[PDB]
Ligand binder design. Structure first.
Ligand SMILES: [Cl-]
Length: 138
């Protein structure tokens, strides 16, 4: 197991065809999980499953620039379940990050930060037991 929060360096940033895979298990009675693809202090892509926002489960995505959050993109399709193992695959495409969970397509998030080769860290945090965080070129 890996210690959460975990920082996975992305050497030379991201590029299309780069696939990031995160394997873990959600804790029982989870409240939130976060993946933060960072460019320095900016967060190019924040992916945030929320297990209880006004008694609804929702995934909130956003970008943080100069410490300010932008417009949220919300997805009510919610594949995570407290206590169960999951696989999140984030595929960098030319115009967006494409996310699949447990081999099923979940959402796309168009690129707001354009300097992909400067998004060089992935922070993984929240209510999970983290098993593996890695990347490969497909
Ligand atoms: Cl940029």
């Amino acid at each position: 197991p890996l210690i959460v929060p975990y920082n996975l360096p992305l050497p030379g940033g991201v590029v299309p065809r780069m696939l990031i895979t995160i394997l873990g298990t959600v804790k029982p009675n989870a409240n939130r999980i976060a993946l933060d693809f960072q460019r320095g202090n900016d967060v190019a892509f924040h992916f945030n499953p929320r297990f209880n926002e006004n008694n609804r489960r929702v995934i909130v995505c956003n970008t943080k620039l100069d410490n300010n959050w932008g417009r949220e993109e919300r997805q009510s399709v919610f594949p995570f379940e407290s206590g169960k193992p999951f696989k999140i695959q984030v595929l960098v495409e030319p115009d967006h990050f494409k996310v699949a969970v447990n081999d099923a397509h979940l959402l796309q998030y168009n690129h707001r930060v354009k300097k992909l080769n400067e998004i060089s860290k992935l922070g993984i945090s929240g209510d999970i037991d983290l098993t593996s965080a890695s990347y490969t070129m497909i």
